[PDB]
Amino acid sequence: DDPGEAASMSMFSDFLQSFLKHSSSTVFDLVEEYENICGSQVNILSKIVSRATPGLQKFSKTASMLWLLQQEMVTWRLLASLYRDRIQSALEEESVFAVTAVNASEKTVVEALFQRDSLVRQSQLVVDWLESIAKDEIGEFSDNIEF
Amino acid sequence: EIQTSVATLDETEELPREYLGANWTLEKVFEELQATDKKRVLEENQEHYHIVQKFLIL
Amino acid sequence: IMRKFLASKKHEAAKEVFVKIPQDSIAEIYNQCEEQGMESPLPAEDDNAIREHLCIRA
Amino acid sequence: SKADVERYIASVQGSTPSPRQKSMKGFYFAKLYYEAKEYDLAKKYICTYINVQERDPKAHRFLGLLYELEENTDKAVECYRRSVELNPTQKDLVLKIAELLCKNDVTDGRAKYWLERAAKLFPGSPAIYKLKEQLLDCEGEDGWNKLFDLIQSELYVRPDDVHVNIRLVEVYRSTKRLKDAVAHCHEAERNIALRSSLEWNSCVVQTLKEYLESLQCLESDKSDWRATNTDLLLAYANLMLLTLSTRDVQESRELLQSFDSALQSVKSLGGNDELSATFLEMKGHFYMHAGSLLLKMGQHSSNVQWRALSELAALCYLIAFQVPRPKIKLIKGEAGQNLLEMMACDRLSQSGHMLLNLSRGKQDFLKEIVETFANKSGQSALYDALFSSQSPKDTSFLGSDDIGNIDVREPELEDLTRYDVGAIRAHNGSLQHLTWLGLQWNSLPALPGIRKWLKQLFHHLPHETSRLETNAPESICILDLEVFLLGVVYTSHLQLKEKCNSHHSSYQPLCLPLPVCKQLCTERQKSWWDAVCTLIHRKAVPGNVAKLRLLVQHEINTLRAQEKHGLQPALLVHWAECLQKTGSGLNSFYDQREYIGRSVHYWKKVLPLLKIIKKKNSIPEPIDPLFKHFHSVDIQASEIVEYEEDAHITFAILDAVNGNIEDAVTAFESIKSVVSYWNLALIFHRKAEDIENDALSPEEQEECKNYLRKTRDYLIKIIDDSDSNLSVVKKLPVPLESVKEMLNSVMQELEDYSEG
Incomplete structure (x- = not known):
């Protein structure tokens, strides 16, 4: 009802099809693809939140979902x-x-x-x-930047 | 490392002893980050990914 | 499940389960014996089970 | 030297005014004295730095290392301890304190406490297992309990191949926990990285004996004794394989005589259980290992006649071939590859290929063996060579066997083609085994089954790769592995030829048995193969993945003949020939076009190298090459005619296999070799088969008859050139009589076409 809570529902398959592509000898390639999946959904959610009229309280979950997956993206970066x-x-x-x-x-x-x-x-x-x-x-x- | 390995000469001013005499550890940095007055940092240093980031760095 | 339905007087529900068992299955249970380091009948749970399914059919 | 460090430190202490500024250079001064082995001058200059910088962990660690090089244990430990106090990130230095305490005093509560601190910084570490082992063997009976729980709990992580599993079995056997020892062997034998150890197999064989030596007349034990003898005979056969491969001739005798003694105790059990089945198969492995011992004796026994050793070895391989393959019923649940099927196929491959390496170029040879030695005189000559006449024959498996019920049949090549497909499962695709089979098939007129073997080992690969000028592991195909193995076999074969160019005998085999043939492939060829296997089967340990990829990405440039490949010209010809002869040998357009495509790729890389030698220029050798150059096959200035004929013949064959038929005919009719005439006859006979005879026009019928005429009139030229020159029959890809089989057909196909 929020769009963000509907749009991020793929990432549970997307991380699984990324796991079933890799091995213990491509285990960093896996986390670099996890960052690309999270960064893709951060890109999608940013491209929804940047189009919300300010004060429309439905987009609260969209903004929390954006920040949650942005902190997840950089936590995969840290791990990698x-x-x-x-x-x-x-x-x-x-x-x-x-x-x-x-x-x-x-x-x-x-x-x-x-x-x-x-x-x-x-x-x-x-x-x-x-x-x-x-x-x-x-x-x-x-x-x-105008001076 | 530099001031242990590079024998400079005739330099008569010091870099401050608060910074040259600084003992560092990873655990220490993540206690100093809990002694800060900055209430924002004290609230962010309780959320799930910032907690994971502390433990992955340690 | 047929033993439950027959005791429950649900003869058609027992016949619905009898139709869930494909009619080759008695021969397929012997096919699965002769290829691979088993005996001449399929084991003693399953000889008794074929005999029981033949009792249920009768 | 000292005097250069002294001259430098004098001028640098001249170019320093204050005493504190001289002390501040003391770390540097101390390192220079250590680099002259002036350890007390290093100590004196690091202490005169520390007394001005009390808190540098590196100055304390350097003073600790100077005391370690003065054997001053607790002063090395104290300066290391002080370096851990001044920088706790040094996990390595916490472990180095545990080293120097357990090496000083095993009772020291500080040793145990610093090992506690090392374990709590590095779990799963053999260096920390070894430092616990050294404390707990010294804690006595209270130690033994903790040492058992340690061994179980750190085995459960799998560091430490061999050692901890032998030390556990010592501790069971000394406590007479003999069924516990054998039950540990029954779990540990499932680890392939223990089954490869001579030390482990020696401990298993001796533990199984000591358990049999404790069993009794009870009806329980009539089952335990069966398992333990099946285990003991299989463990003897693997210990014998390892002892043949790694130890001396006498070390191999005393083991074979121990295996003979263990067959003699089972030999009474005429029956139909899996010990009866194992005993039958283990007669086969015993005679294979006895034939291997006779050829291993020949490898070192400078004064012995190769005939008598190879006769008694041929008898051994004939028995080791004729022992019937186990008639298993493998069941519809058990995903376990049956060991007796794989060992029987490895036996039937190795004994069969060794018979054909010994009968080679003779007549009645297996009948010389049967009529002379399949009898109780030969049974004595075999025993008295293997063991010598110092033990009884009556108390021996061999000395009381039968060897009179023997067949005279040589090994059939399609049976070997099916037994290699079992042997390669036992050897897990080992490059020494694949090269060994490759050299046995390179002793025959038929090609080795490399495509059968590679599509069995690497079934997730494409056969070719449409990206030959690339080196990524993500572009590997079967043909890179086929080319690689053909090159390992070629370079091993030439390094056998050039040994035999001395004092080789017609009773010495050209290839010795797998347990007797010393390493064939280079550690670089192997380091590529083992890395390819480790990447494709995804066994690649973390971090090491990058080393394995960079090594695999090095030799794909070599194998695909890319920029600066450094190969011998004759090896690139052998790769073109073998892929051409394999490509036309397959009932598949896609296989033909991939094989002959890769052959033509190498021919198009050979023609430039020929056009260096045709000027009397040399070619640059690599200081380490993946495949060695060999001056017993370096191309001569005359052969650069034929290696510029067969190259274009192979282009016309590829372009016919492209559908470029009129380019291919034009090429063949420009080349005018008998091999060109044979491909022209095939192209024109195929152009009569591609005419559907259901009510043709007379125009189509007369072009059909003109293709049959073109076929006849090119098959004739192959007879003309072959009885004009009996060398031309040796470029012909078929029997000359099969040119006549086809010519007789193509004449009937013209004369039946003339009575209407």
Whole structure:
């Protein structure tokens, strides 16, 4: 009755047909497609809420469904980064007998740090994630600014 | 890491000891996010996906 | 279910269940014995069940 | 060196005024002394940094590593402990504290507490299992209970192949829990990653004995003793396969003599149960392994005549072929592939292919074997070679067997074609087995059943891929795997040829048995195959998926002859020949056009390489190649005529198979080979079959007679060139007598057309 509560009813099949397409060897491709399914329905719900007359109380569920699936979309984005790093690290850690150079610059100390340090590496993946949320809320708009 | 590895010379001013002497952990950041006065953040730090985001980061 | 309907005097409902059982089924229960490391009749629940379905038909 | 670090640290401590600024370089100074092995100068320079930066976890970790390289356990641990206090994200360093405590004192409550902290940061970790094992073996009888519950609860996660399953069976056998030990073997044997271990199979065989040595005359035990002997004979046959493959000749004797002893105890049970069935099949595996031991003796016994070893081995394979395949009734519920069917097909494949590698190029050979050795003199010569005359024959399976009821029949190739289709199920598509079968078929005039094998192993693939200049795993087809196996067989065959170009004997087989033939394929060929299998069957462990894809995407450039492929020219010819001879060998337009299409793809990649050699230029070799180059098949400057004939013949064959018939006729009549004349005869005979004889016009009837004339008058040219030159019969794709079978038909088809 809300349109949003009717329009998001596919995603329970859409996530299932995405699961039955993948395996434990394409388990990140699965979550990148889960973000594309959520981002597609966020796109559809945004393209309904942007067409609601302000104060029409029916669209309350449409706006809650938009935000719920927008927070879901970025939570799949978060999962798709941090669990990739944590599985790569756990396959490389037997090997990395590194040596620092006597003549290294700030750049190359940090190029070594981001190999050496999974706490710094995962902390930047949270910065990249949170900066990507603010980027997607800016979109096309940069050149519409009258001074 | 830089101020442990890059031996600079004759630099006579410090970066502030509140920031150079900062101990960090992931758990700490998600306690400091519950000590804040910003009531909005204290209400958002109780909703379902922001709770999942804390635990996936940890 | 035929045992329930016959005891309940629902002879037509027992005949409706008898028509839900396809008429090949007695031979199909022997087909499923001779291919694959079984015995000469299908097992002792099912020989008794064929005998019981033949009692119900009679 | 030290003096360079000292000269650098002197000039850098000159270019530093204040003492605190000298201390602030101490970390750097310490690393340079460690990189000279000056460990106390490193200690002295890191401590003079720490006394100015008390809270760097990396300076404390570096001082801990310097104390680990001074064997100072608790000081390494204290500096690591202090580094965990100053940065708790170091899960690795929590585990490294558990290492250096359990390696110092096993009673230390700190060792147990830091292992507690390591486990609560890394569940499912063999390094943490091993650090618990080392505490709990030292907790005694109170330890044993906790160690049992640990073994059960961490096996339930599947790390640790082999070790923990042997250690559990030791702990059952020492506590005389012998039925519990065998019941663990009855569960653990379902894991294929235990069945491959020689150590595991040795423990299983010895545990099954020690359980039989505890059973009694009771009517329960008359069932337990049956299971345990079926298990013991099957475990002997797998342990014997592994011991032939991995151990010496004497290690193989003492095991075969133990298997003989275990057959002799079952041999009295004339009956019709599954121990009676297993015993019959295990006579077959015993003689296959005995024939394998005689050829394994020949591989190392520098002073021994290959005739006597290969005669007694041929007798062994003849018995191991004639043991009848189990007459199973497999039931309409049990999705379990029956082990006795797969082992009997692997036996009938291996013994059959080994007979044909030993009878090769002889007459009456299996009759030399039967008339000389299918008797109690041959039974003695077999025993006295296998075991030596130090044990009784009366107390032996072999020494008291029959070997007189033997047939003289050689292995039929269509029976082998059906037994390989069972053997490849047992070997799970192993590249060593597929290459071994490939070399046995590459000893015969008929092609190996590679398409049968690949559509059995990879039934979710298309046969060709319409995207040959691509390398993605999402564009793989059967023909890339068919080409790959043809190249592994070719490069293995040439690396057998070039060994036999020395002191090879007509009583030495060209291919030794699968348990005796050392590795054929390269670890790179295998690393591609195992990665393809792991990706297609989706067994790809997380993270490693990316390594497996990048390795698979490397060799698809190689196999499809893409940019800089680095292949030998004669290997690209062998791939064109084998795909051409396979393509025309199939009753299917789509299969013909895909096979001959991939052959013509390689011929169109060969013609440029020929046009390097035809100038006396060389071709660049890869420093590591997927398929080796071989100077015993490098193309000579004369052969660059024929490899520029057969290439265009194969184009005219593909373009006939396109429907481009007049292009194909024009090509064949421009080439004028006997192979062109044969395809012209087939095209013109087909152009008489494609005329529907139900009341034709005389115009259609006379063009039909002119196609029959064109056929006759091209079949004649194949006789003209073949008795003019008896080499031309060797490019002809059919018997010369079948050119005459067709020519006699095509003359009757013209003369019956003349009495009306």
